[PDB]
Amino acid sequence: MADPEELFTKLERIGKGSFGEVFKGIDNRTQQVVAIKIIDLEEAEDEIEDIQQEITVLSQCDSSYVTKYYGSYLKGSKLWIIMEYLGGGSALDLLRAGPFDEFQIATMLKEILKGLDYLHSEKKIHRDIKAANVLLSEQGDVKLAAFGVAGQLTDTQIKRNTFVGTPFWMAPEVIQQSAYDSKADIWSLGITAIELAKGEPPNSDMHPMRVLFLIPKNNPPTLVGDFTKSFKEFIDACLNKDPSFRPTAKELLKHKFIVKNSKKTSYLTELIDRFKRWKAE
Amino acid sequence: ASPADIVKNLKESMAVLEKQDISDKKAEKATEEVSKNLVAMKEILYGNEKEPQTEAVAQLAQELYNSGLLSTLVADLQLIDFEGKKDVAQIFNNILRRQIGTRTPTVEYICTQQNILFMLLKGYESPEIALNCGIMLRECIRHEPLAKIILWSEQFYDFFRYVEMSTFDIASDAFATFKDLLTRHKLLSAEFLEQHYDRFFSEYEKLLHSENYVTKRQSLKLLGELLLDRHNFTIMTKYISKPENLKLMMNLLRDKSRNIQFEAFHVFKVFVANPNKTQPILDILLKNQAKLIEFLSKFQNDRTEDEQFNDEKTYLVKQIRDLK
């Protein structure tokens, strides 16, 4: 069966937030650095075919804006899932070192939007868009985490191993359990945007149970403070309470805020650099 | 601006791709022409800011039966653009479910082209295409007359190797088709299992023995599902009779894995619940009488939770205690 424990070397763990067991690792064969996620299968216990569904769907993507899938190996009864590893860090990570320009933000959103467009075209969706899942290569490339990736007619919230454990980036029609599609990702994008500009999402300081009941009732969040009008305008575009009034990704791709402000993706390595310089050890 | 030329351009540009050297002459242009065709073709079928234009769809269909464009396409597929492969799948899968009257024309004009199907299943040996081919195959075994073909095939029993295959992803996808064959068309499937009982279960018995935790679990589980079907009543009675089959489950109940035992249980209980146990069953049950009550008493009593499971448990014990 060729056992992954000798095919790959596990390094520091990075699965602190969800289920657990995501590691940095190395392909012993090729010295390529990978992400390794190990799933029990025994102690699952959301069914096997659900997990294979996650993989089927993930392996269908071959976009330089969505994190690649390299394959899987079964050791006795644990499954090693190997994916592309991005050594720049997450946008969330990169904020620890200081704030971002509008040019930097817009550069990122542009790339996420391309990822998003690619997904939407295959009637796939994302479902966990947040600065934590905005991932960067060491040369400044930007791509969505594989974590959120899903099929257009799949309920990712019912199942363990896929569910989002915080309501902050969630669209109101999702919270209301009603019919929802890719327009909900667009909403999450709007939140991400506020998050990239402000360091945290609207109402972070609030109890998740109050939040869920405000997100439908209240007016949508807005961008506030020293940001350009077109930036604020981009965020209203995304955060419409009515899914129908939200632009597709293709349309956002040519919003003024993106067109005026985005730049060469390489320029983002200044962020990667700033971060390296910033952190300890 | 043409919905009847793209075919006259692939039976061209796709024909080009075999044979040819890795030479520049067809390396870029010839293969990329193919991918651009498959995109404009899928467009005539799916609504960028256009509609599915029906008149063009009728023309589109009666162009592909010219002549065996799909045969050599599916054959020489392993040399296509990655997104092109995914495109082919999308193309194949929707013309398949075309309809005139209450009649599916694609399905019929494949019942001649009987090899298209076996090519697709032979795809399971080439890892660079296997998955696409799965997606396509499952979409056709989805129509009754098509499942009939692979089921009564000699090529059917290749699944037992395709399921045990090296890479777990493909082993999985294989098993998916294997499953969807035996479950989907209920009346048809029950026909197959009656006639080929002996052969089918010899191989299947191997799966239950081979581990590979996932192969073992999934097929043990599929056994349960095929056994309690009702459509399969004849088959299950034959099954729960052989004392080889009861010794097997008994060992599965003894498995290292919680989840495997629990699965084994749901099959095992049908053996004991049988109102018409044949002698060799009763012999092996009576022989192991003490050790069974011993076992079922302490078998996974953390589940409560499960009214039905404990109910099935006190029931099973009563029955074993009560003999001869």
Swiss-Prot record, chain A:
Keyword set, alphabetical order: Acetylation, Apoptosis, ATP-binding, Cytoplasm, Golgi apparatus, Kinase, Magnesium, Metal-binding, Nucleotide-binding, Phosphoprotein, Serine/threonine-protein kinase, Transferase
Predominant localisation class: cytoplasm
E.C. no: 2.7.11.1
Native organism taxonomy: Eukaryota, Metazoa, Chordata, Craniata, Vertebrata
GO biological process, one term: cellular response to oxidative stress
Protein known as: Serine/threonine-protein kinase 26
Protein's UniProt keywords contain Lipid biosynthesis: no
Residues at which ATP binds: 14-22, 37
Function as written in the Swiss-Prot or TrEMBL entry: Serine/threonine-protein kinase that acts as a mediator of cell growth. Modulates apoptosis. In association with STK24 negatively regulates Golgi reorientation in polarized cell migration upon RHO activation. Phosphorylates ATG4B at 'Ser-383', thereby increasing autophagic flux. Part of the striatin-interacting phosphatase and kinase (STRIPAK) complexes. STRIPAK complexes have critical roles in protein (de)phosphorylation and are regulators of multiple signaling pathways including Hippo, MAPK, nuclear receptor and cytoskeleton remodeling.
Family classification: Belongs to the protein kinase superfamily. STE Ser/Thr protein kinase family. STE20 subfamily.
Any one cellular-component term (Gene Ontology): apical plasma membrane
Organism: Homo sapiens
PTM sites of type Phosphothreonine: 162
From-to range in the entire protein, with total length: 18 to 297 of 416
Gene giving rise to this polypeptide: STK26
Swiss-Prot record, chain B:
Cellular component GO terms held in the UniProt record: cytoplasm; cytosol; extracellular exosome; extracellular region; ficolin-1-rich granule lumen; secretory granule lumen; serine/threonine protein kinase complex; Z disc
PANTHER family on file: CALCIUM-BINDING PROTEIN 39, CALCIUM-BINDING PROTEIN 39-RELATED
Name of the protein in question: Calcium-binding protein 39
Gene label: CAB39
SUPFAM superfamilies: ARM repeat (SSF48371)
Keyword terms: Cytoplasm
Localization, UniProt: Cytoplasm
UniProt record similarity statement: Belongs to the Mo25 family.
Assembly and interaction partners: Component of a trimeric complex composed of STK11/LKB1, STRAD (STRADA or STRADB) and CAB39/MO25 (CAB39/MO25alpha or CAB39L/MO25beta): the complex tethers STK11/LKB1 in the cytoplasm and stimulates its catalytic activity.
GO biological process: cellular hypotonic response; intracellular signal transduction; negative regulation of potassium ion transmembrane transport; positive regulation of protein serine/threonine kinase activity; response to activity; response to thyroid hormone; signal transduction
Primary localisation category: cytoplasm
InterPro entries reported for this sequence: ARM-like, ARM-type_fold, Mo25
Taxonomic source organism: Homo sapiens
Function text: Component of a complex that binds and activates STK11/LKB1. In the complex, required to stabilize the interaction between CAB39/MO25 (CAB39/MO25alpha or CAB39L/MO25beta) and STK11/LKB1.
Transmembrane segments: none
Highest taxon of the lineage: Eukaryota
Effect of residue 230 to A: Abolishes activation of STK11/LKB1
Pfam families referenced in this protein's UniProt entry, alphabetically: Mo25
